[PDB]
């Protein structure tokens, strides 16, 4: 099989800048090369076919070039909608083979997280279960830590976290951390806290609720 390889798995760039993704084939593919764009939701769409011809509809800031085993895809005027993974594919020989992709990360102004804590649903309390949900929404950059506390002490077990993909609209990241316990263990305690420590401040953002309150 022809191995298609991309120079990197990811690339970062600022809005308005231009980027170039790169591929080299394991054998000459005589310009039989396509470039695709896969958005987070999973939709795929052709950008450049046969090395440099752009698909009808695709903007001209997109361009492709190269020959032999070496090919390039360039994007000028980066914009948020360009957040995605780009991959090359050769259709010179069977089986067709794809490159593993290069995620495009877009740089942007630092933004603190908007944090929300939610106690279990009464409806879940009945099912015998209780999840404490916490949302660290819309921040930049990527890195962020959440610390959970019950009756004031750090709690770690039962904590599962989940990150979204860079937002195609505002270029931020979001994350939800869920602390799950049993109903019994949840009534056994009184105070719940979610602390997010992020690049944007030394004092973490703390959100909490006390079952005695409202």
């Amino acid at each position: 099989d022809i191995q298609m390889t991309q120079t990197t798995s990811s690339l970062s760039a600022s809005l308005g800048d231009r980027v170039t993704f790169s591929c080299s084939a394991s054998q000459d593919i005589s310009n039989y090369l396509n470039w695709y764009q896969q958005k987070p939701d999973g939709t795929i769409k052709l950008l450049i076919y046969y090395t440099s011809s752009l698909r009808s509809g695709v903007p001209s800031r997109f361009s492709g070039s190269g020959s032999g085993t070496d090919y390039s895809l360039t994007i000028n005027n980066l914009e948020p909608e360009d957040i995605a993974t780009y991959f090359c594919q050769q259709y010179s020989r069977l089986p067709f083979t794809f490159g593993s992709g290069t995620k495009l990360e877009i740089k942007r102004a630092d933004a603190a997280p908007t944090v929300s804590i939610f106690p279990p649903s009464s409806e879940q309390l009945t099912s015998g279960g209780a999840s404490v949900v916490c949302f660290l929404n819309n921040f930049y950059p990527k890195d962020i830590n959440v610390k959970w506390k019950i009756d004031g002490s750090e709690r770690q077990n039962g904590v599962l976290n989940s990150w979204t993909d860079q937002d195609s609209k505002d270029s931020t990241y979001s994350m939800s951390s869920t602390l799950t316990l049993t109903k019994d263990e949840y009534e056994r305690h009184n105070s719940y806290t979610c602390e997010a420590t992020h690049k944007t401040s030394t004092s973490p953002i703390v959100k909490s609720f006390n079952r005695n309150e409202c």
Partner: protein, 208 residues
């Protein structure tokens, strides 16, 4: 306008086979190859093969020879892909695409012995201007699940997080930031659908 519509996600037991459909419209069906691709999270896209509707001519990637069977039906302008002798390494997203590169939306296939579990949907009301609300979509199986807010009405300000798998069950939550004037005053809901279990549930977020 060219469109490729694939059939929804599938849950199959090991050993059976499945047939995925790719319904096309907007271009002459048999005058172009229909290809199929496999994307398994982790790996990259692998080419399975292609068929030419006109005559049923097929070219297969030797690695899917036997696993996959391609057929087309000009009468309905629909291509099919049968994967058989299924095991968990066949679990993945499958795409149909033309040579002229137009792609289907992808079909999610889960091969597993575990049984279907519909999700338990719980509202998340807080305990300012805008206010954030959420829905906890818990203990379901297999993926995917569709979370909407007010039947697709609420759109901007939504965050539906990637499910996390545990004890053979999936869990995710979705958050939504709206205004003080809408909620609680009005009814606000999160619509959750889970195909494998034929279930759809809306949940209104009412103040605690």
């Amino acid at each position: 306008q060219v469109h490729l519509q694939e059939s929804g996600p599938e849950l199959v037991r090991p050993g059976a086979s499945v047939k995925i459909s790719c319904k096309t419209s907007g271009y002459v069906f048999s005058s172009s190859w229909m290809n199929w691709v496999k994307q398994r999270p982790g790996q990259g896209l692998k080419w399975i093969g292609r068929i030419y509707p006109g005559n049923g001519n097929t070219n297969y990637n030797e690695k899917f020879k036997g696993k996959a069977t391609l057929t087309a039906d000009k009468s309905s302008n629909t291509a099919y892909m049968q994967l058989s002798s299924l095991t968990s390494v066949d679990s993945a997203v499958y795409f149909c695409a033309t040579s002229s590169a137009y792609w289907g939306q992808g079909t999610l296939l889960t091969v597993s012995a575990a049984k279907t579990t519909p999700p338990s949907v719980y509202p998340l009301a807080p305990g300012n201007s805008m206010v954030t609300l959420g829905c906890l979509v818990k203990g379901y199986f297999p993926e995917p699940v569709t979370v909407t807010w007010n039947s697709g009405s609420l759109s901007s300000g939504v965050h539906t997080f990637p499910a996390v798998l545990q004890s053979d069950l999936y869990t995710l939550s979705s958050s939504v930031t709206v205004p003080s004037s809408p909620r609680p005053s009005e009814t606000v809901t999160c619509n959750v659908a889970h195909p494998a279990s034929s279930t759809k549930v809306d949940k209104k977020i009412v103040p605690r």
